[PDB]
Subunit: 360 residues, 4 copies
Amino acid sequence: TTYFNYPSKELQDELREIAQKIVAPGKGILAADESGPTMGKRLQDIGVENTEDNRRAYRQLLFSTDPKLAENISGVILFHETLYQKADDGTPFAEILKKKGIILGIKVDKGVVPLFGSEDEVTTQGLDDLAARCAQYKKDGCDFAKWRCVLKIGKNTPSYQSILENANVLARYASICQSQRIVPIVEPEVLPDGDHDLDRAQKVTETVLAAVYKALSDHHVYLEGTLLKPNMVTAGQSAKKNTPEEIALATVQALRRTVPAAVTGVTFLSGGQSEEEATVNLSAINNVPLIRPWALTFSYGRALQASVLRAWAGKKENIAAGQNELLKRAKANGDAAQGKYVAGSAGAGSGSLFVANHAY
Amino acid sequence: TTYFNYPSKELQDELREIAQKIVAPGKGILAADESGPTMGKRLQDIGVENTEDNRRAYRQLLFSTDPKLAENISGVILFHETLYQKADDGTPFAEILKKKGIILGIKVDKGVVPLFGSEDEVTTQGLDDLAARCAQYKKDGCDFAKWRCVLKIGKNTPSYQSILENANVLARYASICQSQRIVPIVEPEVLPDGDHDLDRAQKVTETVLAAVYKALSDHHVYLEGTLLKPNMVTAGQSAKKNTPEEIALATVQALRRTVPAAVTGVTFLSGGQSEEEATVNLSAINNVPLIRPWALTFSYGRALQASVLRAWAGKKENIAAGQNELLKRAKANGDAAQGKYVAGSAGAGSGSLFVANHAY
Amino acid sequence: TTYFNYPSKELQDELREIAQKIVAPGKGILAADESGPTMGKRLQDIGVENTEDNRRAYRQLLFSTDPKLAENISGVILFHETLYQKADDGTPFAEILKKKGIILGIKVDKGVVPLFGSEDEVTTQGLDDLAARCAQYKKDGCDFAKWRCVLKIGKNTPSYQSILENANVLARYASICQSQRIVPIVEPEVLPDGDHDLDRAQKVTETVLAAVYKALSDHHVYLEGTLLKPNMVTAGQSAKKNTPEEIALATVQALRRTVPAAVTGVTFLSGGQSEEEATVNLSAINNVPLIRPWALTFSYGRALQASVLRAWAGKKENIAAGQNELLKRAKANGDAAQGKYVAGSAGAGSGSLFVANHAY
Amino acid sequence: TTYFNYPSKELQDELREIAQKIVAPGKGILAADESGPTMGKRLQDIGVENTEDNRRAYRQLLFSTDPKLAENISGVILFHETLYQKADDGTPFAEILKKKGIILGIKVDKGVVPLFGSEDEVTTQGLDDLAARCAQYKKDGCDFAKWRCVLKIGKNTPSYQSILENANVLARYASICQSQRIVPIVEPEVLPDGDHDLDRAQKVTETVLAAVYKALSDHHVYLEGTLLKPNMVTAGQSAKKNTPEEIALATVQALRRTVPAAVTGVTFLSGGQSEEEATVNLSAINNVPLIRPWALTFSYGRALQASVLRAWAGKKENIAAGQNELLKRAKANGDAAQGKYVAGSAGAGSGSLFVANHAY
């Protein structure tokens, strides 16, 4: 389609400015958008019962950290309930974060659903009344959004069907967010599950990303006002491990071949990578001997929080200890984002954070 | 995608059987799926107040009609509220209809939304939790569904964007319905609005339908278990009218070129056509000297109800008068669906049932 | 694309009329378009030297057959060299065939070429100067054309790439032919090579054809002025054999789901099927209890000639015997194209004529 | 398609190396691939007769220029004829250029052909036996290839059909070239003809390029082994002229949004721009304050030769003069390729080198 309308200058500026801020040098995103159920799995793991109040308590720990955190954390992705919660003293979480100069993000998808007749593949739902939801979220202090699509590597997957549909849904989501003054983070996650090699992973990723950007173009999405949140290119979780060097080259090559320079930044997901791997891999990515026209940073969930949870262990007397773990890993990742992380300098970290059985 | 799963034999048989029943020789659909607001405008016209009870009363009128109706009406499309309503005596509407051997259908879309950056084009929403909704509707006695997409003829529209998106969303909706044992009626309505000619309307209609069937293919929809509800090919509302024969030819040519023989039947929408034109047009379509591999029938709302509303006028006394008008038109359309309607034989009917601008 | 031009009414009529003549009741095509080398293979099997004149002698036999042949043979596909060859008395082959009321076809593709980076897949070349080639062929007495694409069933094939490309090339070829008053036979051959089952062959076939018709639409090809030449749907050559009834159902389902009713006819290739099998299978297809909106006939090469060659055995004394075998099989296939063939009535026929390869 | 083969390491390295060489800092391409007829027009206007020897003569001039030319000219695109000509002393042109370290390119398309049914749109032909052609060209000293597609801005054009087809044929060409160790220059030319504004031109250019790179991905083309030759983004020839800065922003934005960083470089066509304009524009492009991950240089034809021909006039005594004009223009464009050109420092240049009517 050649006859279309570019967003107004006012809107372009606003969206570009938000995206630019999220990927400012030495900064990345803390993904704290776990739903009741998922968060519950994390709590149980440390003997803590999954109650609304326990969830609020944990988020309070994260959110009351020394303002030093804002040096490495540009933004936080929230789950719906958290956006409306308050600290012990009655201060809204939103207010605490804003005061520290952190940008608020919101998870807007409604999870995955099966593609009938496919070989166990999925798409993501949540477009219904998204514009209205976005207008409310924006008023309540949110400036960016998150939506997760899942692609699986198997004998015949991802299929053309899956690639086409996930690419299209991502474009619909992005368009809507942009209409309502919200920066969309596009997240086409190629799952690590399986025993395929790095070559297969690279080819899959390249195929997926090409479809994503063709769909964004078809739906006239303003690229400068978006971020991408892709998987790093690695072999399957059940295959031999690659070196940071190998991962970094395959990843940067895949992005160079598919993601336009107009895209403001890339905020990597960690998948099942340990806290340490996630950092070391990001650092190597920022040392690849190829032109890298976008900011390459992090958007980490488990990879920023496993040690935090372990340290806290549900006790008030361990709050400072938990916050300390967070500060350490944020700094480490901030260094990685500048390609200056020294392996093992932030400590041993966690073990594998791999949880299989996503989408379907 | 060549590796995929056909639906189970038992699911295939069920869907095909339902679709076959809906387009049985001499039968068509009564579309009574007007929402509160729409129904409200129609009532107001006959000096009736838009109360839930007045809507119930009018729907009671239609559904209590002499069982003779069933000879020409195979199915009724319901709006959510109506599916749970009851007659004065306390009998559920769903029971009244099913007792009469009429199949129940349900409108499942959640209306149109604007395509950002487009030249005033739309797509349709309502996929979220559709599978769960369908499962419940099936339980409650529904066997087919309705979902309306709107395409607009203008200087540059429909665009490629609009065509791709509307075709993809129809495919998703259809797939979901089938997974829940519900026959989807695929409805890509090209609006009559404008002063375009028959030539333009035919080319637009052929372009649209090709995309629709490619998308149904891409998503592995079982064609024998679907129906199509298209516009007839006519010049725009503000252009010179064409003859029944010109319309019929253009329409049949368009379908022959795009709709696979596997599609069980075509249930035409009336658009802005008067009750009489809608009947005459359908009859002429059923006399085009070209092979027509599918049933060619009706799925009429205003075109089966304008004279009913007029006759009733909100008066309890006038119930029989209204019902009689319904029987009159149902029979006329039943005849047209067989290419046997004698023009003007059922009366002049109503005026032009055109209301502009459906997308937005 | 909605703004485009239909062919002139005159061109529509001419193309439609030719297509219709080719598939008149009880008639099919004799593919005699073997190149030197290929013909050479054929002559060798019967102990005849591959010379220009031995090939000429053979073609002379075929073409000098009793005009009775025209009752069952509507058209003959020729190789370029043959179109300009003369019988011994100096009469042009073209004139002999035209005098008998047979329509002339010409093979215009320039063979297959590898898709670099693909898993041993191909596309077809021959578009360069095709318009001018067609204009000459038309002048020289040809009214239809032949172009062969090859798709291979394997682990990951046919791929999206292969499907996309083969469909697009077929569409370009068909549009060029039409512009020069030539009816294109669209031939997307899914090879029988392999050990796949009927299920796989059906899914592949339906996928391929959906893409073929979407491309024809994208390129604005006038369907009524075209024919389709597909494989019957069968399991692979190295898998268990299906019954004629199983093949027939799978084939007719596949066509009903993808080939628009506007397509004037389907002229099946025989693949590696024996003379008798090709006949029996065609008859079963014409007896499937489902709506078949197009003629279903034959376009046979080896399946029409194996026994001819054998009876002839390169000897002038065996001309009667040779021509008799042709008459017998043409009749048997004309009967089959009407669903009236009685198994074994035309004799045992050839062994298997399966030759492995194609594409490359 | 996710299952495919990357080119061998050896092939990758060779193609990347060639492309890198062509876009070396301060260097660009001399397009001297004018066909007999085209060259004839140029000569006619200088009052020289279009004879094979006249062409040979004029080409001798260009190629015999002071070896200093090689400082700003990385490569020369040749017309088939020229590749096999010799100087007066009988030194093959190919030999002359190579000794000077200039890389040889060859135009391999066979011109444009009409898309039947389109609103006067075209595609490009010349794929037939391209591999065998390329093999030979490589042996004969050529390392890169040229192929021109033409897109027209009009009321409804470029259409989806045109975009799809031109993108697809570029990908086929590129793939074949690569298979034969030849670097393809991808040239999707959007014509300047018309009275559209800069906004329209940018939107069209972005649409075209997105399709081109989707097609390259679909056909698995190695982007690092390619170059892009696009039009600068300007308003129509009959529209109000834009400033170099406006042109520059539009162009860089368009490229950033569509051309992967993996693409080794962009070598701009001049369209109908004057010699000075083409230089000033290129210089401004290399000054846009936005990241530009690829070399942005020239591939000029008329824009490098206009003044040469004028200086020459066909007189043997003006050889030195013509050669001097070439050197001056190459220097200025080399500077421009670095963003260092001082407006009007190279003379004045021709007036308008615009010739309307490219496709058809």
